[PDB]
Subunit: 1003 residues, 2 copies
């Protein structure tokens, strides 16, 4: 059997794992992320390559690696980038299973074997020329990442092969190179034994995923080096620098290796050198430990970096090679049961992140930069490399801009399960587990941003992880090592059990003799309209010293954008490619805080608010005394500016100011703002607090709001100076059969496009579809197919009382409702509703309120209530109560799977008008919720893809006295009890005011 | 109609509020960038707007988002599209390819042509919009929006304010947006229509696409700016040595104080050779400054061979002499005229070795600098000295490249109304379309009037003749005194300074030149149609061009194939053409969009190599074959042969170099020089030897290094006709079997091992090339006679121990009688099998034949091909001046050329012998009694013929062999002359033989 059918054949003739040692000509580029690519000793091989794709190995062009073989008849392929995103094969998205374990491929899972006839082969080949200056030097071929398995040849000679798609494979091709035109070929296989360990919940793709390049060094070169830059454990102020270097290659004469540690300024702070001479082919050099008093420490808030410059020299002292990396002084450890950075316990405010773009697993520098920019802007301080090491550029960015990292080994055998068949318990797979672990470690061991090593993901627990854990502990004395499937067994330094509820977190921290902190590997599943219940999670994290937070599951949605025959775009997910029957797990690949093109979803804004590091509470309402808590770990509040004000419900600034508060990290401080005169013309005022940074960073300028808060101040509950004036004569008609308000006119003009009815359903969010108290129960009760049947109707000159039965499409009695429509002297229509559900049929409701439709011409929306964005009761700490203007089209968020959206909470009043200024003012007798969308609930619920959405000329209005929160049931807890809609007799009202504001012309 | 139809339905609404056509006046900060192609893009006064734009597409204008141009309009829910780039190549609409018709004139769109109207409900609307910020250093300056090219029609808005609209997709449309710009975020929007009245003048034989095709950008100048300027870099008409410099400049905008305009013409080293300055100050917002004529003695002249360029630096200065604006262009001193009935550059009559060129890439009409550089590089490498901008002005960069690398250009106005015809309804005769014609002509001229590479102005293409074209001709004449103006449809009427009638045959060329009172040279606007396996008969064309003073060549039709590359469900790629996109019934003219010398990704077709050989500027003839004295003609117009190196050698048929050397020769342009290489003894072990000549230049060019072969020739030298030293040795015991029914050689064995996968039969057909499918003597007759469905039937058979004689009837699929065949199979003492054949066709049924030879198949394992013959590229009898005879090694796969439409390929001419073996070295050696032709392909003849797309080609494990005693040329019948008489297979009785030697 071929090598790709063996779990043992992880590689052949490759260079031993090591830290990146790119040779530089200019030491100045070492501090520049990706600067090594501009070195004259570096040559990219990215670009166009001849390509051929075939299903079944027996049909492949076997001799294509021979230089003489003709490829001129082949097409070109872009390298890097998965081939499925370039017109070949089929992209498949499955979760806990292996895509090849399906009848479509006539194959059943059976490690280490994978399908033969069904396997796919992508043959890559391109020509290249070595620079003249590389004459006589050593040349190395580096493939940063190729998925699944591949053999590689240079000028017809087989270099070897590789398994392990997320870390680089390298080969010394010096003795195989020729003068002039050279040839490099890779024969890539979609599946291989290694695939059993790459069962991550993500798109299963193929091809060369990352950069392919050449780099040149002298015959004796710097092959690897280990940095240790910590602090003294007593006061965490003195830097402790330790360095070890490995030189390899033959050398008959003497030589030496010297190093210089420079500060950002350029001044050398540490320097040393050792002489070497040996007939052997490798030299291990251990430098004397050095100290730096008052060293500039590295942390997420202040990513101070020193530059390490290594130089290999001749016996004459001439520099033959120069290389290096950035160095950050800090400590990472679990002290007294708590995770601490530089001796300071820190709250982990993170997110998981997969590498994803429209090209597939390939991610550009621009996208990597945008990811980290958005992360910092949204108060995220930690990233977990979602189940595999990332492109080296990512680590460089985190070092530079300050972001903690949980680097992770490319190991996930979810498909084999956690039972006795788990590959974690199969010793024949130790080679594969250890290989991936060694590669993860050696390549990134010197990055200060990495604070935690993760052994892998849901690959089971047993001997293999006990061994890779032991190995990691033997080489790493400055970073905790964790693994979620080890749960509470010895082989994990942090308890990171994923998706546990608040109660389960409390249960853990309240257990006797625990010695490790609880930091969720994954929590708050952000699929679709989600992230509800975040507040409950953080009230615990902020109160329990050994419950330090976690990483939100997924930063960016794994969707691809396609355009249909009518030019309508949509996001794609499982099952959207290939013939019927193709393995699929649907829309579960989109779980991000932002969409595939990095546009934030509304819930990311909730995350920004909950993750902010400056939190205040109102201590004294009359004199406005606030208690500020500084949640930064290494920054004083005086590094930020407080910009406050007080505004009436009408939006006028009643008072304002600017302060600079001094406060130690983790300390609280009181700041009195002073009483404010509230007019009798406002029912309430709002104390607004907004913070920004004095000094800008390259990712966040001085205008960005880093944290904010709001407190509601009571005013004149009796004033009505907000209500609009009478616009004219208002009239209403009641349907004699449904009892619903079928007509509402203003001087004869009809305002309704659909009648006002009782609404109890909501087009299911993805969480609603899995929540124990969600859509399953709403659809079972038939709450989405409601009908009203009058049993009593008493009309009057200006009012009408009615009792009607609420029936589902089955005829069953969902409940009983009473409506009282009365017309006020001001022309305003008050609508009181009293609903009594039949608890024997209705086990849960999505909302309780009224719904109707209007022409889509009424697109101008204005409202007094919570924020500029979408919020729900269990996700509304974010935003601000205030006056907002927008449009219906603007409020609609395009979730991959069309679902409920555009909700606004803590609403006092909402208003909708057309270009001419005509419309309606809507309010209740207490804060309510509302949503206006450009589609019908019917179509929104039915649609599973964006492109199915179609307008019909009407907008849909929902006025809610009650509406459930969203939870995170797609994976983890559903909506908490206190956010579920009560299923009991309830009464509520809404008053509609017709309005005529006129047509205002302006720029 | 209560309301008028929208602007896009009127031939008069060509533009609104746009800048008057002018030469590019990009403001620079670093004069050093003027002489650099595309340099202006690096200026701090230039800001590109290319990139990601919000996009929305709809069929039916009534369905478009009307208020999208308003900044407050929300586009967050829209997708993004790349700008520039036709939208059909970005997943929107339907790419359509039609030739002489309007794609909207079809039942599918419920519309019939009716100028100036285009469909309404079926029209497409592409809504583009993006945000942008203005550079802080642009505060107070004039800012201009420039759209280099958008197709069919579009409205443009900035910050919600309608700037105007435009018709004319191949020249820039600009607007002064200074007054509508605002601090902070600005918004620019374009509402583009697939069809508009202007489309009636954009009926070129090319893909019909939509959207923003070229760069969109902003540039800023001060309030008083350099609006336009006209350069005239000529030479005296008596000696053509003294350069004459003239320059006019137009300055627009206000200015309270005094100002002045100055210029400095610098040579390549940066030294000033001319300079002057004029003062100006007016209450008028427009000032015209014409400088005094200056002269340069022995000025460095510009031409395709030596494109010496000067740099014109213009500076607008304050009252204090402070520069307010810097700009300029490259200057090339030369004259272009029709002198004594002959086209002459700098007083010299030049042969036009050109090609037509459309702008094409996988993104559509949009072409990258990388592709433009490749185009020009390949052109120069293959000895092309002229390029015709195939029916529309190109992107500015193309002209800059031609100025710098030396390539003559025929710029052409974006005017073609082929769909309306040349009759009474021709838009060239409808006076209401004058504005449309004149607007496009003005724009073509103003934008490029200063490029030295442009030597001829063309008014358009296949748009009829009449009042409109006579008017535009007269206009160009009133403004241009240094360039000939031509129009092919004007034929021989007054409005054209050059007779460029397309696709005329050799006789027609001779007939014109021999006509009384002609006063204009004949230079084909288009000729030698290069569609599929084409370009036959090129030699006959150039024998005339080289010997007829007033027949000076022309431009081959199409540089590059207009095909797109797609990938099918099985991962097999293929070239697409008309009808490959959209629903059944979509307008289409099939594979006629691919007529290039190179494929869409610029890979050369075999015929470009013939072009290179015929267009070469150094040609020799063997005058004395004893002392090897050759006569060399220098065809360059401005270069002495001493700028080149001649590497020569004599090689025997066995490939051993018998003599070799290197020589430098002096020879003025158009002159000839004799060179003696000396007698060379030939061993009696070779039947012949070849005198090889190869030239390369002494000094490199950025595009052509010193290793590049710029010209070559070969002469066959007689050797010992009786030697058999070359023959392979007996490898074993040979045996054969003759089929009792067909009389075919059904078995050939070596020591009992079968070598044939299919019997050896008589072959008279060939999978049709695109030309064969239209040739008067092509595949229509071959298929009508059923030559592609032949069966042999023995009527007589007589067998001896080592030989067999048979006579058989050749019947088509309809039992008819194609002819009578006689075969004689005989084995040599050394195991060789001699196959003698005599064919007598029945001229009543066979009116034409593709070839006359044998055919059979072998396992694909036999992939090693070797041969002695005209080698290292595909050739045919009417296309084999290129390449040389010699020993060549290759594989079957390497010989198959992938023509968009699968057709015959891989043929080799002047073959002495061919050999085919497997890796182990086992196979068969093949020869005749005289030079022959052969082809070996990895597909069957049946499938190759049937296949219309490359992905339909499928291997069956067998390769197909063809040994031809005769095979027709390929001609250019797809459009123009079919195969010439002397290259048709004679339809008569003929005998021929082939001998097969099994090898091991
Ligand atoms: Cl890996
Ligand atoms: Cl134009
Ligand atoms: Mg999993
Ligand atoms: Mg035409
Ligand atoms: Na998922
Ligand atoms: Na839905
Ligand atoms: Na054509
Ligand atoms: Na064909």
């Amino acid at each position: 059997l071929p090598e790709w059918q063996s779990q043992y054949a992880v590689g052949l003739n490759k260079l031993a794992p090591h830290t990146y040692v790119w040779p530089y000509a200019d030491a100045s580029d070492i501090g520049k992320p990706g600067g090594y690519e501009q070195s004259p000793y570096y040559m990219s091989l990215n670009g166009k390559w001849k390509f051929n794709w075939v299903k079944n190995p027996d049909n492949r062009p076997k001799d294509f690696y021979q230089p003489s073989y003709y490829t001129g008849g082949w097409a070109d392929i872009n390298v890097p980038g998965n081939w499925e995103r370039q017109g070949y094969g089929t992209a498949i998205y499955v979760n806990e299973t292996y895509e090849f374990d399906d009848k479509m491929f006539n194959f059943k899972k059976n490690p280490p074997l994978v399908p033969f006839a069904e396997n796919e082969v992508g043959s890559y080949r391109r020509t290249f020329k070595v620079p003249a200056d590389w004459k006589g030097r050593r040349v190395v071929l580096c493939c940063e990442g190729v998925i699944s398995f591949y053999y590689v040849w240079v000028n017809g000679k087989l270099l070897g092969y590789n398994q392990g798609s997320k870390t680089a494979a390298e080969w010394d091709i010096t003795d195989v190179l020729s003068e002039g035109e050279n040839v490099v070929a890779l024969e890539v296989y979609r599946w291989s034994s290694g695939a059993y360990l790459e069962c991550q919940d993500m798109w299963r793709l193929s091809g060369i995923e990352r950069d392919v390049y050449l780099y040149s060094t002298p015959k004796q070169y710097i092959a690897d080096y280990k940095v240790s830059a910590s602090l003294d454990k007593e006061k965490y102020k003195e830097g402790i620098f330790n360095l070890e270097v490995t030189v390899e290659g033959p050398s008959a004469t003497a030589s030496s290796i010297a190093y210089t540690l420079k500060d950002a300024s350029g001044k050398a702070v540490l320097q040393d050198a050792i002489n070497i001479k040996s007939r052997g082919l490798s030299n291990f050099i251990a430098f004397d430990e050095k100290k730096i008093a008052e060293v500039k420490a590295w942390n997420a808030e202040h990513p101070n970096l020193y530059t390490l410059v290594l130089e290999l020299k001749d016996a004459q002292g001439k520099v033959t090679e120069l290389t290096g990396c950035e160095v950050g002084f800090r400590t990472s450890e679990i002290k007294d049961g708590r995770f601490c950075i530089n001796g300071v316990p820190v709250l982990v405010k993170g997110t998981n992140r997969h590498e994803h773009s429209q090209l597939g697993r390939t991610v550009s520098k621009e996208l990597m930069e945008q990811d980290i920019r958005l992360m910092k802007q949204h108060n995220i301080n930690m990233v977990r490399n979602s189940h595999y090491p990332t492109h080296p550029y990512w680590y460089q960015l985190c070092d530079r801009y300050g972001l903690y990292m949980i680097d992770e080994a490319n190991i996930e055998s979810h498909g084999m399960g956690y039972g006795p068949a788990s590959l974690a318990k199969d010793s024949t797979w130790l080679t594969a587990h250890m290989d991936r672990t060694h590669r993860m470690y050696e390549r990134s061991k010197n990055h200060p941003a990495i604070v935690i090593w993760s052994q892998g993901n849901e690959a089971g627990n047993g001997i293999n992880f006990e061994r890779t854990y032991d190995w990691l502990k033997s080489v790493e004395k400055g970073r905790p090592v964790q693994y979620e499937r080890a749960e509470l067994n010895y082989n994990t330094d942090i308890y990171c059990r994923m998706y546990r509820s608040v109660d389960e977190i409390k249960a853990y921290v309240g257990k006797k003799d625990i010695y490790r902190p609880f930091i969720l590997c994954e929590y708050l599943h952000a699929m679709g309209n989600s992230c509800g219940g975040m507040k409950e999670y953080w009230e615990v994290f902020e109160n329990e010293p050994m419950a330090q937070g976690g990483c939100i599951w997924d930063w960016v949605d794994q969707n691809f954008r396609e355009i249909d025959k009518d030019g309508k775009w949509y996001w794609t997910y499982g099952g959207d490619y290939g013939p019927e029957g193709i393995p699929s797990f649907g829309n579960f690949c989109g779980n991000g805080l932002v969409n595939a093109v990095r546009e934030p979803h509304p819930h990311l804004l909730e995350v920004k608010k909950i993750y902010q590091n400056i939190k205040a509470t109102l201590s004294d309402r009359k004199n406005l005394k606030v208690c500020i808590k500084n949640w930064y770990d290494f920054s004083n509040l005086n590094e930020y500016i407080l910009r406050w004000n007080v505004k009436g419900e009408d939006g006028t600034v009643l008072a304002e100011g600017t302060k600079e508060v001094d406060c130690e990290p983790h300390a609280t401080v009181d700041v009195t703002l002073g009483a404010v005169k509230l007019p009798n013309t406002v029912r309430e005022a709002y104390l607004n607090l907004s913070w920004s940074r004095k000094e800008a960073t390259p990712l966040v300028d001085t205008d960005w709001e880093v944290a904010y808060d709001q407190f509601v101040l009571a005013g004149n509950k009796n004033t009505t100076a907000y209500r609009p004036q009478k616009a004219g004569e208002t009239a209403f008609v009641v349907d004699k059969n449904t009892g619903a308000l079928s007509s509402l006119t203003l001087d004869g003009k009809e305002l309704l496009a659909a009648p006002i009815t009782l609404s109890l359903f909501r087009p299911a969010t993805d969480n609603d579809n899995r929540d124990r108290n969600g859509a399953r129960l709403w659809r079972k009760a038939g709450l989405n197919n409601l009908t009203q049947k009058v049993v009593s109707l008493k009309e009057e000159k200006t009012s009408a009382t009615v009792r009607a039965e609420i029936l589902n499409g089955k005829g069953q009695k969902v409940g009983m409702a009473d409506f009282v429509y009365a017309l006020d002297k001001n022309g305003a229509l008050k609508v009181r509703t009293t609903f009594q559900p039949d608890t024997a049929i209705v086990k849960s409701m999505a909302r309780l309120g009224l719904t109707f439709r209007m022409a889509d011409a009424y697109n101008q929306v204005s409202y007094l209530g919570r924020g500029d964005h979408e919020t729900y009761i269990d996700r509304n700490q974010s935003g601000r109560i205030g006056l907002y203007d927008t449009t219906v089209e603007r409020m609609f968020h395009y979730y991959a799977t069309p679902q409920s959206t555009a909700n606004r909470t803590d609403v006092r009043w909402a208003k909708l008008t057309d270009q001419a200024g005509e419309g309606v003012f809507m309010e209740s007798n207490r804060p309510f919720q509302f949503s206006i969308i450009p589609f019908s609930d019917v179509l929104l619920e039915k649609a599973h893809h964006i492109n199915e959405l179609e307008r019909d000329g009407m907008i849909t209005i929902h006025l809610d006295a009650e509406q459930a929160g969203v939870g995170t049931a797609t994976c983890g807890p559903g909506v908490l009890p206190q956010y579920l809609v009560p299923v009991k007799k309830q009464s509520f009202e809404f008053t509609l005011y017709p309005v005529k504001e006129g047509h205002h012309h302006h720029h």
